[PDB]
Amino acid sequence: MAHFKEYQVIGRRLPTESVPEPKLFRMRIFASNEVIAKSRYWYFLQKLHKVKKASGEIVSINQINEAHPTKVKNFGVWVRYDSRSGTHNMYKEIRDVSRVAAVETLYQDMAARHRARFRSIHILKVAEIEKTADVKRQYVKQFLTKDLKFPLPHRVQKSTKTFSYKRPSTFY
C-alpha cells in the first residue's frame, strides 16, 4: 500500500502422497514489498479455493516490470469496493506510462472520491485499451484529440526568501 510494484505470485497446495504435483495458480498482485504481495496472494486464494497458507506454499514470486515504460497508454481499470453502506463494481480509466503508475492513481482516486481506503478495494482487471475510442470516459478522451495544446494560466512561483522587493507576477 504505497509506491507500487507488481508481482507475479505463483502458489499451490502442499503435495500429498495422494496428489503429488497439485495444480499451480498465479495472481498478479500490486503491492509495495513482497511480504505484502504474498499476504495478498493468500487473501485472494482463500476466497477462491479451499486453502490456507498453512496447507499451501508459494512456489515463485517475481516482479513484473512494465514493457514499455515510456509509451503513454490509456488503461481500463476494473475495481470492486466497499462503501459505508454496500459494495460496488466500478470501471474507471487512467492515462499513464505504466500499470504500476496507473494503479497508484487508482488508489488515490478511490480515496479522494469515495473515501475508500486500501483494505476496501479489490483490483479486478487492469488493461491497456488498444484502440482509441474504445476509450469510454470523457476525462481521458479529452487528451486524445489531434494537436492538443493548452496553456497553464496563473503561475505561482515559490519564493526562497520571506520578503521580496517587487510585486510578483503570474505570467507564464
Partner: protein
C-alpha cells in the same frame, strides 16, 4: 480607434515540441522536450542532448520556455535527437537573456576571492569614467 482591439495572453503552451527547463532533481538545470501529454499535470519529456532520460514528469517540476520545435508526438529518443539538432534548439536557448543570466550567475559564483578583488578595482575604474560623463550632458 476603429479596429476592435483585443490583446490576448500569449501563454507558453504545453505541446509536443515545446521545450522546457527542468527545475528540480538530477536533471535540474537541463533542457528537455515535451514528447506526449499525459494529463493536465503530467507529460512525457526527453532530453537526449543534455542527457536527461526520457521519463514521465510532473509539469510543476519543469518550466516552459518560449522555444518549441517540430516533433511528431510520441517520437522515440533517437528521432527526438535528430529533430532537436535539426532545429538548433541549444543555439536559440544560449542566445536568450534567460540562458545568459544563468550563465552570468554561474560565473559570479565561481569567482575567487582574488577575482572578487579585481572586479572591485575594475568597477571603481568604470564608475570613475561614468560619473564625469554623467555630468557633461
Amino acid at each position: 480607434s476603429t479596429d476592435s482591439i483585443v490583446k490576448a495572453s500569449n501563454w507558453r503552451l504545453v505541446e509536443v515540441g515545446r521545450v522546457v527547463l527542468i527545475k528540480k532533481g538530477q536533471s535540474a538545470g537541463k533542457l528537455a522536450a515535451i514528447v506526449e501529454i499525459i494529463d493536465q499535470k503530467k507529460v512525457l519529456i526527453d532530453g537526449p542532448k543534455a542527457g536527461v532520460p526520457r521519463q514521465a514528469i510532473n509539469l510543476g517540476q519543469v518550466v516552459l520556455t518560449p522555444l518549441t520545435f517540430a516533433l511528431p508526438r510520441g517520437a522515440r529518443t533517437a528521432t527526438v535527437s535528430k529533430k532537436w539538432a535539426a532545429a538548433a534548439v541549444c543555439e536559440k536557448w544560449a542566445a536568450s537573456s534567460w540562458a545568459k543570466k544563468i550563465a552570468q550567475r554561474e560565473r559570479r559564483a565561481a569567482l575567487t576571492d582574488f577575482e572578487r578583488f579585481q572586479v572591485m578595482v575594475l568597477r571603481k575604474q568604470k564608475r570613475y569614467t561614468v560619473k564625469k560623463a554623467l555630468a557633461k550632458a
